[PDB]
Amino acid sequence: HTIFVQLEADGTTYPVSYGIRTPSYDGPITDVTSNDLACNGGPNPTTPSDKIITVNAGSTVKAIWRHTLTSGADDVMDASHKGPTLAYLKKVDDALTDTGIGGGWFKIQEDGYNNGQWGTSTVITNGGFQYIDIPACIPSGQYLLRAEMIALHAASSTAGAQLYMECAQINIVGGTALPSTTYSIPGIYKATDPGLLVNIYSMSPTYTIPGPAKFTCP
Numbered sequence: 001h002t003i004f005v006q007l008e009a010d011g012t013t014y015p016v017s018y019g020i021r022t023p024s025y026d027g028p029i030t031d032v033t034s035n036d037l038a039c040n041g042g043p044n045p046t047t048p049s050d051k052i053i054t055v056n057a058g059s060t061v062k063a064i065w066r067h068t069l070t071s072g073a074d075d076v077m078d079a080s081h082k083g084p085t086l087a088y089l090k091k092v093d094d095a096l097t098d099t100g101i102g103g104g105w106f107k108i109q110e111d112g113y114n115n116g117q118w119g120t121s122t123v124i125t126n127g128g129f130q131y132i133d134i135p136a137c138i139p140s141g142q143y144l145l146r147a148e149m150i151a152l153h154a155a156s157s158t159a160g161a162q163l164y165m166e167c168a169q170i171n172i173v174g175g176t177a178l179p180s181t182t183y184s185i186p187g188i189y190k191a192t193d194p195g196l197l198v199n200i201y202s203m204s205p206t207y208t209i210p211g212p213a214k215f216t217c218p
């Protein structure tokens, strides 16, 4: 149970919920066919924002995670909630109106299982920071940035995987082109994916991270 509550970009750490469509409730999405998968919603209604955060292309941003909106650095997520972390971008005409539901998404970050250490565990232990590299080669303009943590502690059953995501409203600044291939959310995940329907208690130090291949600048 966790929420992407604030974003650091270009040397500024913005306030809780600034530019981020945060739910007040920290519960999971478990149906990967739901439109709620894009930017949360449904059982976790989100709070609208009229703010857009400036982000330099080619820079690293930091998605900061907390158990609840007012939690501190020792209360990111239950350490049992082992799984991957991921991040996606979608180019949008207007970050104040686009719901993120549908096509246009591309993966820009993923952290799976590395010699016994899960991506979520690293975010928990490093103070709730998920590090995300914004591609250098993409066009300026408005985007949604979707950051995600997936807990797999109950994932050996269908729809047992727990997905926690929020969308930040950003304006990317600074030879440019979008990726050739983009994807739909919902669409990228299926309940039978080998990284979602999985028994993590039988792994020794390959985990197949769900979703499309990460975009790399050409």
Ligand SMILES: *[C@H]1O[C@H](CO)[C@@H](O)[C@H](O)[C@@H]1O
Residues within 6 Å of the ligand: 194, 195, 206, 207, 208, 209
């Ligand atoms: C995810 O899928 C790959 C096959 O591409 C496997 O290496 C892995 O065990 C998991 O099933």
Ligand SMILES: *[C@H]1O[C@H](CO)[C@@H](O)[C@H](O)[C@@H]1O
Residues within 6 Å of the ligand: 213, 214, 215, 216, 217
């Ligand atoms: C660009 O290249 C890197 C590997 O060097 C991948 O992480 C990415 O998926 C894309 O192929």
Ligand SMILES: [Cu+2]
Residues within 6 Å of the ligand: 001, 002, 078, 081, 151, 162
């Ligand atoms: Cu939880």
Ligand SMILES: [Li+]
Residues within 6 Å of the ligand: 179, 180, 181, 218
């Ligand atoms: Li490409």
